Structures are given as C-alpha cells and as structure tokens.
Design a protein around this ligand. Structure first.
Ligand SMILES: *[C@@H]1O[C@H](CO)[C@@H](O[C@@H]2O[C@H](CO)[C@@H](O[C@@H]3O[C@H](CO[C@H]4O[C@H](CO[C@H]5O[C@H](CO)[C@@H](O)[C@H](O)[C@@H]5O)[C@@H](O)[C@H](O[C@H]5O[C@H](CO)[C@@H](O)[C@H](O)[C@@H]5O[C@H]5O[C@H](CO)[C@@H](O)[C@H](O)[C@@H]5O)[C@@H]4O)[C@@H](O)[C@H](O[C@H]4O[C@H](CO)[C@@H](O)[C@H](O)[C@@H]4O[C@H]4O[C@H](CO)[C@@H](O)[C@H](O)[C@@H]4O)[C@@H]3O)[C@H](O)[C@H]2NC(C)=O)[C@H](O)[C@H]1NC(C)=O
Ligand code: XWK
Ligand code: CA
Ligand code: CL
Ligand code: K
Ligand code: NA
Length: 806
C-alpha cells in the first residue's frame, strides 16, 4: 500500500507487504505504489525521436530520450540512432550470417528473447508478408518452420504455459482458459485473481529452470495495461543492467493479432493494421538491440500460441436440442465442450445416458462426444482431475453451447465475434508460427513443422541449462541449431530376449484350440527350419528389433513372413514386425482354416493363451497381429494362426482391424513402394499415456489371465524416396502410425453401418499418432538399427501424419 517506486521502476524482484510493488505485474494485482504511473509509465512526447529532439537536454519526464547521454543511460527511443546519428533501421540492413556471437564485454552467454504473439496463424507469414518487413526478415534470414503445431486445446493459457514448460496441459495443469478444479472447488479464468494462485500452475517453467541453475530470468507474464512500446523499452533497459544484475532470458508478449482476430475473423480487412503494428514493435526491438550492439549477440524466438478460425454465433450447436434434462449439466462451452454434473456428488447423474443422447443424433452434427479416455491419444488430454469425463470435440468453424440464452444476449442477440480458436490441434487454421534468429540458430534455414512441446528443451540448450523432465524429445530439434550442447543417445535396453527353440510336444497343450493342419519332402524341410531360426529376419525386421525399456520376460519368435517379441507376462506379442512389398498378393483365409488356432511348440502351455477362454467370453473374440491375408505362400499361412500371434478383439473392433489388414496394408504398400509394419497391443487403463504395469489391468478375457488391450497400434515405415522399395532404402525414412481405441462398439463412427470402405480409414486418420506416443505407451524403443543419424531418427519419431490439406 505505502512507499514509492523512485529508483525501482520495473524492478526484477517482487516485494511482499508492507511494501507496495514496482515490478511488471503490479498493475495486475492493483498493488503498485501510488507513484508508479508517474515514474514508471511515462508517455510524454511519445515513443520516437524527431530531428528537433536530437541532442536535446535530458528531460526526465519524457517517455524515452534523444539526449546525448541516452545510450549510456540505456533509455534512448529505439529510433534514436536512425534519426539522430545517421544509422539505418535494422530491417534495411542486408542479412549477414551470424557465425559467432558478437556480444559486448561482460556478456557471459547470448541472451534469449522470446517474442510471443497471441493468435498468430501460420498462414499470416505468407498472406501478410507485404505488411511485415521486420518479421519477414527474421523469417528468411534465420531458421523457420512452415508452421508449428500447438497443443490441445488450442487456447492461449494452455499453449503459453506449454511453451514455458515443455509439458502437455494434462501435466502442467493449465487444461483450458477456463477450468474448474473439484478438489479446490474453485474456477480459474483469464480475468480475475484466482489465476494468480500458484496452486494451478505445475511443472517447472523456463524462468524457474534458469534461476535454479544460476541464470537470471523473471516470469514471462505482462500486465495488459502496460503498452507495447513500454514493454520493449523495459526489456532494453534491463539489457543495460550491470553484468551481475542483468537477466539472460526475456519475454515480450503481444495480445495481437488475437484480440482483433476474434472481432474480425482471421482475414478480416481490419486485420492488416494489427499485423503492421506487431511488425513495427519487432522493428523497435531490433533497432533497440542494434543501438546496444546486441543485434548479432541475442537469440530471438518469434513464436505464436495458436491460430484463428472463422466462427460466428449462428454456427452454434445447442445441447438443449439434444438433452431433455439440460439443467442437470454444467458445460464449459465454445470451440471445445467439457460436461460435468451441475450438482457435485449427485448419485443419479449418468454420463452414459448423456453420451448416448449426444451420439450421432443429427446427420450434419458439428460435434462428437467422447469419454476423455477415448479421445485420440495424440491429444494427450485426459490425465488431470480438471478435465471433465465427458468431452465434446467441436468441428472447426463451430461452437457448442448449453442453451440459446447463453449465446443470444438481451435485447435481441447481435453477434460481434467472427473468429475463435481452441479446436483439435491438427486443424490447419489452428497452426501457428516459429522463427529463430541469432548466433545459435541456423542461417537461412527451413525446418519441418514441429510441436510446441519441443521448444522448452531447445530454449534450455540456448541458455546452457539442463531441462527439467518434460514431454519434448530432446535432440529432435537439434537440426534448428548451429551449435548443439545436447548429444542425444539411445536408451539402454533393460530386458534381453529369450530365443526359444522347439521345446514342447503337441500333446502337452490343452488349449481347447483346433486347426485343420495335418494335411500334406526334403527340400522345403531345411528351408522351414532356416525361417524359424531367423533367415528372413533382415527382410521383416528392417530397423533392428525394438528395445524393451523395462523389466520383463519375453521371447523372439521368427517366421517366414513376420518376427515378433512375445511377452510371457501378457501372453501376447509386445510387437509384431513384417514387410509387405509393392508386389505382394492378398489372399483369403481358406474355408478349412476359418477357426484355426495352433499351439506354438516353442512356448510353454503355461505361457500361452487358450481358445476356451474366448469361447466362454461371450463379448470377446480374437484377431491376429500378423495378418493371414498377407501370407507369402499357403504353407507360410499356417504360421499366422499360431496361438502366439493371437490377440483379444471385440467383434466391433475386428471390423476395423480386418479392413486395415486385408485392404489398407496392401494399399499403403502399393502407394509407398512397400511398407514395413510393426503392430501390437497397448494397455493404458489409467489413461496417463504410459505403459501399464500388469497390476493396473482392469479387464481380462473371461476366466483367464489374458489381459485386454485398451488400444492397438501400428507403425508403418517406408523409404522417403519412394522410387526405392521399403526393404532397399538407402536414405531417410517416411512413417505414419496410429493408436486405435479397442472399443466394443463403433459409436464413434456415425457411418459404421456402411461398408468399412466408407468409415474405417476416417477413424484411423483421426487416431494418427507419433512413434514417440507409442513408445511411451509400450516401453519400447524403435529404429535402433538404421543408417541414419540419431537426431534424424528422433525427428522421425516425433513426426505426426495429420491428413490435412495445404
Ligand atoms: C510428460 O512429462 C511429464 C514430466 O516428466 C510426465 O509426468 C511425470 O510422470 C511421472 C510418472 O507418472 C510422475 O511421477 C510421479 O511423481 C509423484 C510426485 O509428484 C509430485 O512431485 C513432482 C516432482 O516435483 C519436483 O520436481 C519438479 C521438476 O519438474 C518441480 O517443478 C517441483 O516443484 C518439485 O521440485 C511434481 O512434478 C508433481 O506435479 C504434479 O502434481 C502437482 C500437484 O497435484 C500438479 O501441480 C502438477 O501439474 C503435476 O500434476 C500432474 O502429474 C500428477 C502425477 O504426479 C497427476 O496426478 C496430475 O493429474 C497431473 O498430470 C507432484 O507435485 C510421485 O509420488 C510418484 O511416485 C509414486 O507412484 C509410482 C508409481 O507410479 C511409484 O513408483 C512410487 O513409489 C510412488 O508410489 C506411492 O505413491 C502413490 C500415490 O502417488 C501410491 O498409489 C502408492 O501406493 C505409493 O505409496 C511418481 O513418481 C511425475 O509427477 C510427472 N510430472 C509431472 C510434471 O506431471 C508425463 O508422464 C509425460 N507424459 C507422457 C505422455 O509421456
Ligand atoms: C505461475 C506463476 O508464476 N504465477 C501465476 C500467474 N500469475 C500472474 C500474475 C499476473 C498476471 N498478469 C497478467 N497476465 C496476463 C498475461 O501475462 N498474459 C496474457 C501473457 C502470458 C505470458 C506468459 C504466459 C506463460 N507461461 C502466460 Cl500463460 C500468459 C497473467 O497471466 C498473470 C499471471 C503470476 C504468478
Ligand atoms: Ca498407463
Ligand atoms: Cl477452455
Ligand atoms: K467369444
Ligand atoms: Na456407429
């Protein structure tokens, strides 16, 4: 309450009561000293030097200075050298490679300045290029991606705090712009004081990582009323502090273009000016750095949080059109929906009835309901008590609301928003920007699109920090950097495989299985043993066997057409690997073999599944990981019916799996010039995105110890140069992968009553995944043996095939 900001303007360490505050957040708290506006928010004469001000006598009342002592004081207007000393604007200088940091004496490391822009959609870089010369120079001279993928939901606070932490929102806890925490019994909103409480904010953001390791860094937050020109001048003044006091990491935040984009839509004619204004702010920063002789010293990152889509009030779905009992729910509305019971601890609120009432009710329905554990695993949006059990994924360009009165406000509801964001993070309009410029970034370099979760590790590298544990894959963005301080290495294999031979006679098994395999030589007798010993393994295991990164007991099983790693604990393969060439032939399962399952004489009865359990379980059927349809010969096809290739499958899911195996695998082999497929089960009953231990499994095949997978994955690899076949590729690889939910119905697919050709591939595309997602869910490590660099393989493992257009 009481005291003064004299000598304290934008102080870096925040003070507690009794003392009032003078730091860059005091306005948000209504806790600034009474003279903060007078001393710290000077506006007199605006932000630019003019010719008549050059060499003026210093007037301490001015916003910034054009007096001769201003460089020494560190408080010149940013254009001072241009107007008063014949210098050129940074933007007017030619791009010149920054091979080494060119820093003043006393600089122990290149500072990092993070320039974050709210709502800056990726395509602004092309579509607004004529009005953003400073930004276009950073982009073309530095390192840029064509776009950067935000996290879900594609909202401001979840994405900004992901930038700062390298964590998914479910881990850092900022799961939306609005949230309710049922343990706190409290709500977080963009406006208000509740968000000030540290209890909402988990993980370890960069400013804390830096400070713990002796690198000075304040928080990245800004009070909204502090104008942009003053934020830039404040950063430039901090950069003028003595070496022992000066931060090494800085954050500028702009509320634009998002603020205007909501009002005018992403490409409204009103959007040109906010793009020009952000560009001018970038120019002020670069000119100011150039004055301080820091423009070839500092690393600058120009980064957005999310993009912006066209969304209008008339494109609103109302839950009151679907639910008779809409007053029994609370909805977090908008470009996503989150539903919970209106009254806490209510015994007779049924999420299953709500889901049903919201499922495929109108043909053009513009949202889909999910239990959060059923959302695509790529969204990583479930493991937090602030995420409601019922989630509505809203179509791009749409909103969901509970009742019409929520949207059309009195008198009679006019709209007055035309843009919004928050949709699925694969949606093109939600993609945002990344540019890195400075001595540590590459020169004039384009990099592929990547996810914002990866940036925290890079920012730690840029500062010489060890990153806190996060969801980036450290090394996957080494290709952005001229000088890398991190050398990634493969995780050590924890469990070594057994390689069993023929150890059991047929009569030792009592599995209740049958197969018509007795029917029908010395030439093909040796060839069989060779195949069982691994003679075709270099064809079907193209990138080495996967490493198992936890303690377990498993066997490598070789066959003519496929190899597998068979878990004696889970009684099924952890992975099955097989290559299908462009020329491969699809065949049927012969009539006489429809219900064939065969004991595997390499694997004990005690470590085998059994057909009786499947007969008895009236809900559960089975399928096979290596598909019998893709056998190389009628004789090799018998290997596909081994009990060691069988996995539990609901009949509903078998429709999906059989279409993938019979139709799609061969299609991809045709289109990609062969594919290598690795398939397997995933168990994630606690929806944490991580491999379950055996004591976490909640469902088994009835009367057995056969665990039921929650999902089934495949990783489908080929040669990036598709003129070379998958099995003879000399260069970089191409991958697409999926994690399909193992569900007892196809309620997710509204067209599922149609032939699989009309709906299965759409479902698979929705559940596209990165190899890294499968690695977390399985405890396996892939691509152990390739001819490619490890950094390149880490980039491959973070790739997501999105299926969007351009
Ligand atoms: C994405 O990356 C992240 C980060 O690597 C991955 O998330 C990590 O996942 C780990 C495994 O699940 C998990 O380990 C837990 O940790 C428990 C301790 O957790 C607290 O302390 C953490 C460390 O804090 C310190 O270091 C950090 C540096 O990062 C500093 O910032 C801190 O200030 C500290 O110095 C802390 O990060 C963690 O934060 C969570 O909880 C906070 C308060 O609720 C939230 O504010 C915050 O947002 C985090 O919330 C997330 O994570 C929790 C789970 O921790 C989750 O519930 C939330 O929904 C949200 O997702 C805490 O403050 C530790 O007790 C655990 O050990 C128990 O379980 C294991 C078995 O799983 C046993 O081996 C062990 O013996 C022990 O068992 C005993 O206790 C059990 C009950 O806990 C009991 O049932 C049992 O019977 C036993 O008695 C375990 O190690 C990390 O916490 C987690 N980190 C984060 C930030 O989320 C994530 O998995 C990656 N995702 C993917 C898909 O790969
Ligand atoms: C964790 C912690 O140290 N806390 C909790 C938050 N507290 C706090 C106190 C005051 C504030 N004034 C203003 N704004 C608005 C704002 O800063 N924007 C919109 C930009 C922005 C920048 C970086 C991140 C990031 N990362 C985020 Cl998400 C948002 C606040 O968000 C704000 C927050 C400070 C103490
Ligand atoms: Ca799990
Ligand atoms: Cl939200
Ligand atoms: K059955
Ligand atoms: Na359906």
């Amino acid at each position: 309450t009481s005291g003064s900001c004299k000598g304290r303007c934008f102080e870096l360490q925040e003070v507690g009561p009794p003392d009032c505050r003078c730091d860059n957040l005091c306005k948000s708290y209504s806790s600034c000293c009474h003279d903060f506006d007078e001393l710290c928010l000077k506006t007199a004469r605006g932000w630019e030097c003019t010719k008549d001000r050059c060499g003026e006598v210093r007037n301490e009342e001015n916003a910034c200075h054009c007096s001769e002592d201003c460089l020494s004081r560190g408080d010149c207007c940013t254009n001072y050298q241009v107007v008063c000393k014949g210098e050129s604007h940074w933007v007017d200088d030619d791009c010149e490679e920054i091979k080494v940091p060119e820093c003043p004496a006393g600089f122990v490391r290149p500072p990092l300045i993070i320039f974050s822009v709210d709502g800056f959609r990726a395509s602004y870089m092309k579509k607004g290029s004529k009005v953003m010369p400073n930004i276009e120079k950073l982009r073309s001279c530095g390192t840029h991606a064509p776009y950067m993928r935000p996290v879900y939901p594609t909202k401001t606070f979840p994405n900004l705090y992901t930038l700062a932490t390298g964590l998914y929102p479910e881990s850092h806890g900022i799961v939306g712009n609005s949230m309710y925490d049922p343990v706190f019994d409290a709500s977080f909103h963009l406006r208000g004081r509740e968000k000030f409480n540290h209890r909402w904010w988990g993980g370890q953001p960069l400013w804390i990582t830096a400070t713990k390791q002796g690198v000075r860094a304040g928080t990245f937050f800004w009070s909204v009323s502090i104008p942009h020109e003053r934020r830039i001048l404040t950063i430039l003044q901090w950069l003028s502090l003595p070496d022992n006091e000066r931060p090494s990491v800085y954050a500028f935040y702009s509320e634009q273009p998002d603020f205007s984009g909501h009002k005018y839509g992403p490409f409204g004619p009103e959007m040109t000016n906010p793009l020009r204004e952000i560009d001018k702010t970038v120019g002020q920063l670069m000119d100011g750095l150039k004055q301080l002789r820091l423009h070839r010293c500092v690393n600058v990152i120009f980064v957005g949080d999310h993009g912006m889509e066209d969304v209008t009030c008339d494109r609103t779905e109302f839950l009151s059109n679907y639910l008779t009992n809409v007053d029994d729910i609370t909805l977090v509305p908008g470009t996503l929906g989150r539903i919970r019971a209106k009254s806490i601890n209510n015994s007779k609120y049924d999420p299953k009835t709500i889901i049903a009432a919201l499922t495929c009710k109108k043909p053009d329905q513009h949202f889909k309901p999910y239990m959060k554990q059923h959302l695509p695993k790529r969204l990583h949006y479930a493991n937090n008590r602030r995420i409601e059990d019922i989630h509505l994924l809203v179509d791009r360009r749409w909103h969901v609301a509970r009742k019409p009165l929520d949207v059309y406000k009195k008198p009679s509801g006019k709209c007055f928003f035309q843009g919004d964001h928050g949709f699925d993070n694969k949606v093109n309009s939600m993609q945002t920007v990344f540019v890195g410029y400075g001595p540590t970034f590459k020169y004039r370099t384009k990099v592929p699109p990547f996810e914002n979760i990866e940036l925290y590790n890079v920012m730690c590298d840029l500062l010489g920090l060890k990153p806190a544990p996060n969801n980036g894959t450290h090394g996957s963005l080494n290709h952005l950097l001229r000088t890398n301080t991190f050398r990634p290495t493969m995780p050590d294999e924890v469990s070594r495989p057994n390689y069993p031979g023929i150890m059991y006679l047929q009569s030792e098994f009592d599995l209740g299985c049958t197969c018509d395999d007795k029917v029908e030589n010395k030439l093909e007798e040796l060839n069989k043993r060779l195949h069982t010993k691994g003679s075709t393994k270099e064809r079907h295991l193209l990138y080495g066997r996967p490493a198992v990164l936890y303690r377990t007991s498993y066997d490598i099983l070789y066959h003519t057409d496929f190899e597998s790693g068979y878990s004696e604990i889970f009684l099924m393969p952890l992975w099955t690997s097989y290559t299908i060439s462009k020329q491969a032939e699809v065949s049927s399962i012969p009539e006489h073999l429809t219900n064939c399952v065969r004991p595997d004489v390499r694997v004990s009865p005690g470590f085998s599944q059994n057909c009786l359990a499947y007969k008895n379980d009236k809900q559960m059927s089975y399928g096979f990981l290596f598909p019998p349809y893709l056998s190389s010969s009628p004789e090799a096809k018998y290997d596909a019916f081994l009990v060691t290739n069988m996995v539990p499958m609901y009949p509903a899911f078998k429709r999906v799996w059989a279409y993938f195996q019979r139709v799609l695998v061969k299609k991809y082999a045709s289109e990609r010039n062969g594919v290598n497929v690795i398939s397997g089960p995933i168990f994630d009953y606690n929806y944490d995105g991580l491999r379950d231990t055996e004591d976490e499994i909640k469902q088994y095949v009835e009367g057995s110890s056969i665990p039921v997978p929650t999902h089934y994955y495949s990783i489908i690899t080929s040669c990036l140069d598709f003129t070379q076949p998958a099995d003879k590729c000399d260069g970089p690889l191409s991958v697409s992968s999926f994690i399909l939910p193992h569900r007892p119905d196809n309620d997710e697919s509204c067209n599922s009553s149609e032939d699989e050709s009309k709906w299965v591939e759409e479902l698979m595309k929705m559940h596209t995944a990165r190899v890294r997602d499968i690695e977390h869910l399985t405890g396996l490590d892939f691509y152990r043996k390739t001819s490619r660099s490890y950094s390149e393989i880490l980039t491959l493992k973070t790739y997501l095939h999105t299926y969007e257009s351009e």
